[PDB]
Amino acid sequence: CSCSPVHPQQAFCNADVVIRAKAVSEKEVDSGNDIYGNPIKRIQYEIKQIKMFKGPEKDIEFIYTAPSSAVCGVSLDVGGKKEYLIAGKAEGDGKMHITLCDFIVPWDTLSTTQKKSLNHRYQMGCECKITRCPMIPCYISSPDECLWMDWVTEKNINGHQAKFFACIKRSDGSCAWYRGAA
Amino acid sequence: MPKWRKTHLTYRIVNYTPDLPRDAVDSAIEKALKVWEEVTPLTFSRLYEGEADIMISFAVKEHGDFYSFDGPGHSLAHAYPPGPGLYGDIHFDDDEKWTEDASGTNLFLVAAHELGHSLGLFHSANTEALMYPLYNSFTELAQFRLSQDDVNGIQSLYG
Ligand SMILES: [Ca+2]
Ligand SMILES: [Ca+2]
Ligand SMILES: [Ca+2]
Ligand SMILES: [Zn+2]
Ligand SMILES: [Zn+2]
């Protein structure tokens, strides 16, 4: 598995479902299959949905992921009273799947602004492009685009812009980083 | 299997991304293999038809394996440990823009990492290791190097 990092807004905008949850139990299941005899196993986590910021009216009860990290499988701390913010993909009623490359962090690690941004601010900015800068100097191509500089300035994916900023469209058509409101 | 039970393995490039001429895809994968050929008694040979051990392909979103790709960014590719059928195979997400240089997602760097999985390696927590899932060795191509952590892993399997 190979991931490129994701700013929370990107995650939030790309994901079908965004929830606060705890994983209670873990177990393997076979959902497939494969065109020769040989079957594909997935870990099924049983979860409790504490809260939904984005996604379907029917609560998520199960999260799937791969058994190995080679296919982007992720471990959640099960039993262990561990709450997470999980951004991922809907997979029919009450089910979603996640990968190693998804935005998935313990609830208690989020800044106050990140948490508040889940109400509205991230959604407002989905029309804006967020572009990670690989190295200084880097330049926007289009006006509706923010440069994500955390790695370049901080060597930290959960840096300053991740923690406090959203990339919002600015009356006129330019997008810009904002530290926000609410 | 945590490892292949043979020395001579086959691969085939099943399909081809629009982002690059076929010859450029061919070359990037050949180099990525080389990376692992230089430090093990493994040799790979190319098949142009039928089922090779390591079936390499490009796909977007759902592509038949229960592990859907996820659009631009996020997961760039994934692969399966040694085994029959789907095992050992490599899938690249064609919602990435695959390039020869570092302008887009570099195919060679990603293919090298994923081949590691195809051979039995897991992820490394070392951020200078190729097997670290997050760009592994960020830029330097004309002087990219396996880390010793990567070499230890692969030589622990194949000598
Ligand atoms: Ca195979
Ligand atoms: Ca992707
Ligand atoms: Ca592409
Ligand atoms: Zn990997
Ligand atoms: Zn796949």
Author numbering:
A (entry chain A): 1 to 182
B (entry chain D): 105 to 263
From the paper:
The matrix metalloproteinases (MMPs) are a large family of secreted and membrane associated zinc-dependent endopeptidases with key roles in extracellular matrix remodeling.
Here, we report the structure of the human MMP-10 catalytic domain (MMP-10cd) bound to human TIMP-2. The structure of human MMP-10cd bound to human TIMP-2 was determined at 2.1 Å resolution in space group P1 with two complexes per asymmetric unit. The final model included 341 protein residues in each of the two complexes, with three calcium ions and two zinc ions bound per MMP-10 molecule, and possessed a total of 160 water molecules. The two inhibitor/enzyme complexes in our structure (molecules A/D and B/F) showed small but noticeable structural deviations throughout, and alignment of the two complexes yielded an r.m.s.d. for all equivalent Cα atoms of 1.150 Å. Close interactions between the MMP-10cd and the C-terminal domain of TIMP-2 are quite minimal in this structure. In total, formation of the two complexes results in burial of a similar area of solvent accessible surface: 1247 and 1232 Å2 for MMP-10cd and TIMP-2, compared with 1173 and 1242 Å2 for MMP-10cd and TIMP-1. Our data suggest that these peripheral interactions have the potential to significantly enhance MMP/TIMP binding, although they do not appear to be well optimized to do so in the MMP-10/TIMP-2 complex.
